[PDB]
Amino acid sequence: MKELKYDVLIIGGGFAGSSAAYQLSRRGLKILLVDSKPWNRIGDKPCGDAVSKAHFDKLGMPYPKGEELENKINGIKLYSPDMQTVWTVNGEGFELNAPLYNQRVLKEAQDRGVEIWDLTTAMKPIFEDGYVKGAVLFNRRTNEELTVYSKVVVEATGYSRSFRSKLPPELPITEDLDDKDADVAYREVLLTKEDIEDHDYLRIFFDQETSPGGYWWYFPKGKNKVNVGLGIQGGMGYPSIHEYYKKYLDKYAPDVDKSKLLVKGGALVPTRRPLYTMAWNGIIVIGDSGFTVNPVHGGGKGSAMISGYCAAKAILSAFETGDFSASGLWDMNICYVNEYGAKQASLDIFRRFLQKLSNDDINYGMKKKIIKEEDLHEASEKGDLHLSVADKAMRVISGLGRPSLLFKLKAVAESMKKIKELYLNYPRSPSSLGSWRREVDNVLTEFNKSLS
Distances (CA, A) of 44 to 47, 103, 302, 306: 8, 10, 16, 20
Does position 287 interact with ligand FDA (CB under 6 A)? The reply is yes
Instruction: Tell me the residue number closest to ligand GRG, measured at CB.
Output: 93
Is 16 annotated as contributing to ligand binding? yes
CB of 418 to ligand FDA, least distance (A): 27
Does position 305 interact with ligand GRG (CB under 6 A)? The reply is no
Stretch that binds ligand FDA, among 9-17, 144-152, 315-323, 404-412 (CB under 6 A): 9-17
Does position 306 interact with ligand FDA (CB under 6 A)? The reply is no
List 227's β-bridge partners, or say none: 189, 219
Which of 163, 410, 192, 158 is CA-nearest to residue 287?
158
Is 46 annotated as contributing to ligand binding? yes
- φ, ψ at 96 (rounded to 5°): -100, 150
Is 297 annotated as contributing to ligand binding? yes
Which of the choices ligand GRG, ligand FDA, none does residue 54 contact, using the CB cut-off of 5 to 8 A by kind?
A: ligand GRG
The residue within the footprint of ligand GRG, chosen from 4, 75, 191, 411 (CB under 6 A), is 75
Neighbours of 156 (CB within 10 A): 33
Q: How far apart are CA 314 and CA 308, in angstroms?
A: 10
Which of the choices ligand GRG, ligand FDA, none does residue 42 contact, using the CB cut-off of 5 to 8 A by kind?
A: ligand FDA
Which of the choices ligand GRG, ligand FDA, none does residue 68 contact, using the CB cut-off of 5 to 8 A by kind?
A: none
List 124's β-bridge partners, or say none: 136
The residue within the footprint of ligand FDA, chosen from 29, 33, 46, 132 (CB under 6 A), is 46
The residue within the footprint of ligand GRG, chosen from 299, 308, 365, 430 (CB under 6 A), is 299
* 233: CB partners within 8 A, 6+ apart: 180, 182, 183, 212, 213, 214, 271, 355
DSSP of 16-71: HHHHHHHHHSSSS--EEEEESS-GGGTT-SS---EEEHHHHHHHTPPPP-GGGEEE
Closest CB to ligand FDA among residues 281, 303: 303
229 in Cβ contact with 216 (< 8 Å): yes
Which of 317, 318, 288, 280 is CA-nearest to residue 305?
288
35 in Cβ contact with 17 (< 8 Å): yes
Instruction: Tell me the residue number closest to ligand FDA, measured at CB.
Output: 14
Does position 69 interact with ligand GRG (CB under 6 A)? The reply is no
Q: Tell how far CA 123 is from the center of its chain.
A: 24
Does position 187 interact with ligand FDA (CB under 6 A)? The reply is yes
The residue within the footprint of ligand FDA, chosen from 99, 282, 300, 341 (CB under 6 A), is 300
Stretch that binds ligand GRG, among 20-28, 45-53, 144-152, 256-264 (CB under 6 A): 45-53
CB of 177 to ligand GRG, least distance (A): 16
Q: How many residues bind ligand GRG (CB under 6 A)?
A: 22
Compose the 133-172 pattern: x for residues touching ligand FDA by CB under 6 A, - for all others.
-----------------------xxx-x-xx---------
Torsion of CA 241, 243, 244, 250, to 10 degrees: 130
305 in Cβ contact with 15 (< 8 Å): yes
DSSP of 407-426: GGHHHHHHHHHHHHHHHHT-
Does position 99 interact with ligand GRG (CB under 6 A)? The reply is no
Pairing outcome for strands 50-52 and 215-220: unpaired
Which parts are annotated binding residues?
15-16, 35-36, 45-50, 55, 122, 288, 297, 300-301, 340
Contacts with ligand FDA by CB under 6 A lie at 11-17, 34-37, 42, 45-51, 121-122, 156-158, 160, 162-163, 185, 187, 229, 266-267, 269, 287-288, 293, 298-302, 304
Contacts with ligand GRG by CB under 6 A lie at 48, 50-54, 73, 75-76, 89-93, 185, 217, 231, 269, 297-299, 377
